[PDB]
Structure formats: C-alpha cells, structure tokens
Amino acid sequence: HIDLPPGFRFHPTDEELITHYLKPKVFNTFFSATAIGEVDLNKIEPWDLPWKMGEKEWYFFCVRRTNRATEAGYWKATGKDKEIFKGKSLVGMKKTLVFYKGRAPKGVKTNWVMHEYRLEGKYCIENLPQTAKNEWVICRVFQK
Amino acid sequence: EEHIDLPPGFRFHPTDEELITHYLKPKVFNTFFSATAIGEVDLNKIEPWDLPWKAKMGEKEWYFFCVRDRKNRATEAGYWKATGKDKEIFKGKSLVGMKKTLVFYKGRAPKGVKTNWVMHEYRLEGKYCIENLPQTAKNEWVICRVFQK
Numbered sequence: 001h002i003d004l005p006p007g008f009r010f011h012p013t014d015e016e017l018i019t020h021y022l023k024p025k026v027f028n029t030f031f032s033a034t035a036i037g038e039v040d041l042n043k044i045e046p047w048d049l050p051w052k053m054g055e056k057e058w059y060f061f062c063v064r065r066t067n068r069a070t071e072a073g074y075w076k077a078t079g080k081d082k083e084i085f086k087g088k089s090l091v092g093m094k095k096t097l098v099f100y101k102g103r104a105p106k107g108v109k110t111n112w113v114m115h116e117y118r119l120e121g122k123y124c125i126e127n128l129p130q131t132a133k134n135e136w137v138i139c140r141v142f143q144k
Numbered sequence: 145e146e147h148i149d150l151p152p153g154f155r156f157h158p159t160d161e162e163l164i165t166h167y168l169k170p171k172v173f174n175t176f177f178s179a180t181a182i183g184e185v186d187l188n189k190i191e192p193w194d195l196p197w198k199a200k201m202g203e204k205e206w207y208f209f210c211v212r213d214r215k216n217r218a219t220e221a222g223y224w225k226a227t228g229k230d231k232e233i234f235k236g237k238s239l240v241g242m243k244k245t246l247v248f249y250k251g252r253a254p255k256g257v258k259t260n261w262v263m264h265e266y267r268l269e270g271k272y273c274i275e276n277l278p279q280t281a282k283n284e285w286v287i288c289r290v291f292q293k
Contacts, residue, residue, distance in 0.1 A: 005148065006166040007181060012153030013202045020152035034151065055157070 002034060009054050010035045014084045017117050017138055018092040025061055026119060026132045036060055036138065045072050046099045046112035046141065057142040062116070063135060073101045075114060083120075090121025111144040146180065156181045156207070160233040163266050163287055164241040171209055171285045172268060172277070182287065184209040191221050192248055192261040192290055205291035212267075212284050221251045224263055239270035260293035 012021075025031045037052045039060040044051050052058045065077045075097040084092035095116040101108035117138040125134050158167075158181075171177045178184070187210045195206055217224040224246040233241040246263040249256030266287040268274060274283070 002151070002154075004154070005179075005181070007156050007158030007162045008150070008154055009157050010153055011155050011157040016153045016202060035153065 010059070011055070014082070014094055014117065015086050015091060018084055018119065018123070019086060022092065022117055022119060022136065022138050023123060025136045025138075026123075026128070026134060029133065038063075041068055041139070042070070045070055046110065057140055059138065059140050062137045062139050064137075069103065070099070073099055073107060073110065074103060075099055084117070086122075091119070091123055093118050093120045113142055113144075115140040148180065155202070160231075160243055160266070161235050161240065164233055164268065165235060168241065168266060168268060168285065168287050172283045173281050175282060175285075182207040182209055186210060187224070187288060188219055191219060192259070195290065196292070205289055208288045208290070210265075210286055210288050212286055217246070219248075219251075222259075223249050223251075223253055223256065225249055225256075233266075233269075238273060240268065240273050242267055242269045262291055262293055264289040 021033060021036050035053070036059045039051055039062070041062045041064055052060045066074045068075055076099075077095055077097050079096045081096070082094045083090055084094060095118070097114045097116060099110045099112035099114070101110045117140075119128065119134060128134055167179055167182055170179075183206070185208050187208065217226075226244055226246050228245050230242045230244045232239055233243060244265045244267070246265060248259040248261035248263070250259075266289070268283055277283070
C-alpha cells in the first residue's frame with residue numbers, strides 16, 4: 001500500500017511507461033507493479049469500471065486495423081502513432097485506438113479510447129534479446 | 145517522515161479543488177504553511193523562460209505561492225495579462241475558488257510580444273467560504289501554476 005499526499009497520483013509520461021513499466025515486463029518474466037495490473041484484452045469490455053484505478057483512467061498489461069475485436073464491438077486504429085524518445089534515442093510507439101459499439105465496419109462511435117504502448121527503436125524486436133517476450137504491451141483506457 | 149519516495153510516474157497532478165482545499169486554504173489559515181509540491185516565490189522576481197533550466201526530468205509545470213496584488217502582474221522583464229473568463233471551482237454544492245488564466249508578454253507594457261508561457265492563478269472565493277473564515281486567517285495568497293503552451 002502506498003500513502004499518497006493529496007494531489008499526487010499516477011500520471012506517467014510516455015517514456016516513463018516504456019522505461020519503467022514495459023521494458024521490465026518484457027526483459028524480466030517475473031515483474032509486478034502497483035499501478036499497472038494484468039488483464040486479458042478480449043475478456044473484459046470498455047464498460048468495465050471495477051477491473052484494474054484513478055483519474056478516470058485505467059492502465060494494464062496486455063498479452064497480445066481492427067485486429068482485436070470485442071464480443072460487443074471492436075477497436076479501430078486511428079492516427080499516426082507517436083514516437084517515444086528517451087532523449088536522443090527512440091524507445092517506443094503509442095498507437096491510438098477508438099472503440100466502436102456496432103461491429104459493422106460502420107459501427108456506432110463510442111467515447112472509449114485506448115493508448116497502446118509498444119517497444120520500438122532501441123527496443124525493437126531485432127535489438128531485443130531472445131530472453132524477452134515482446135508479446136506484452138501497455139494499454140491506457142479512458143472515456144471521451 | 146517527509147521522504148515521500150515516489151514510484152516512477154507518480155507526480156503532483158492536483159485537481160482544481162484539491163489545490164484549493166489542501167493547499168490554498170491552509171496557507172491562508174497559517175502563513176507559515178509549506179508543502180513540497182509548491183514553492184513560495186514572488187512572481188515579480190522570476191522570468192518564466194528561466195524555469196525549464198531548473199526543471200527536473202519530466203517536470204513540465206511549476207506551482208508557487210504568491211501574494212495578491214492590488215490594481216501588479218508586473219515583471220522586471222515582462223508582464224502577465226489575463227485572458228478569457230475565470231473558471232469556477234466547486235467542492236460539492238459550494239464554490240470554493242476561482243482559476244484565472246494569464247499570458248506572459250515582453251518587458252514593454254505597450255505593444256508587448258506574446259509568449260507561449262501561460263499561468264493559472266488560483267484564489268479563494270465563494271461568499272460563504274470567504275465569510276466563514278476565522279478572523280485569524282489572511283487571504284493574501286494565491287497559487288500560480290506556470291507552464292508552457
């Protein structure tokens with residue numbers, strides 16, 4: 001348990017997410033943190049307040065374009081992914097996805113948004129050692 | 145213990161009402177209030193472009209206790225000019241304060257040069273909140289958040 005003074009909360013920069021949460025989850029198989037739980041993507045749905053937080057945003061690890069669709073909708077990738085720089089080095093990429101209610105290609109537009117952080121640049125699959133599972137991503141999900 | 149070791153990514157990120165409730169009120173109660181999150185400096189003595197040089201890593205905004213002015217938003221090398229409409233701050237069904245936005249301009253008060261340095265000044269307010277202070281309190285303080293567009 002962590003005893004936060006008032007006003008202090010979990011509000012990470014991108015490079016903080018990579019460097020101190022995602023690279024460890026990849027490099028070390030036994031990794032845990034107090035602010036980022038583990039959830040399987042396909043199981044839950046964007047209307048799942050109890051699973052995993054604070055400031056109306058929810059972070060977690062994910063084990064795995066509309067390449068992932070929900071029992072009740074899908075996630076559509078939107079926009080040019082932002083690059084994550086640790087100073088002069090590239091370290092990761094942030095994809096932005098939006099959740100669509102109706103499963104049809106013209107599906108109902110919900111206000112649920114996800115940021116998917118992945119390892120890149122210096123931590124691309126080629127540079128990554130084989131003692132690593134590049135299958136892990138970080139997702140931040142929020143509304144509107 | 146004031147050590148407050150913070151895991152990565154945890155940082156001061158108050159809501160407007162948390163600023164009022166846990167930081168401004170205590171300062172106007174006791175002038176000798178201090179908190180690690182908020183410095184105490186005279187906005188007059190500091191030019192904002194100096195701030196990113198003393199920035200710790202990932203630090204993008206700065207909070208300060210300052211004194212209230214009376215008709216002066218003035219800086220040796222510049223000046224702050226308000227903009228837009230002040231914004232109400234609530235605790236439940238009560239107004240407890242307001243937040244004003246200001247923009248920084250070049251030293252010359254006529255025809256200054258607009259900067260991308262923005263300020264949010266936070267002040268107590270609300271008829272009943274301000275009316276029910278103990279006579280031992282002094283409402284001569286505001287909280288300034290300084291940051292860059």
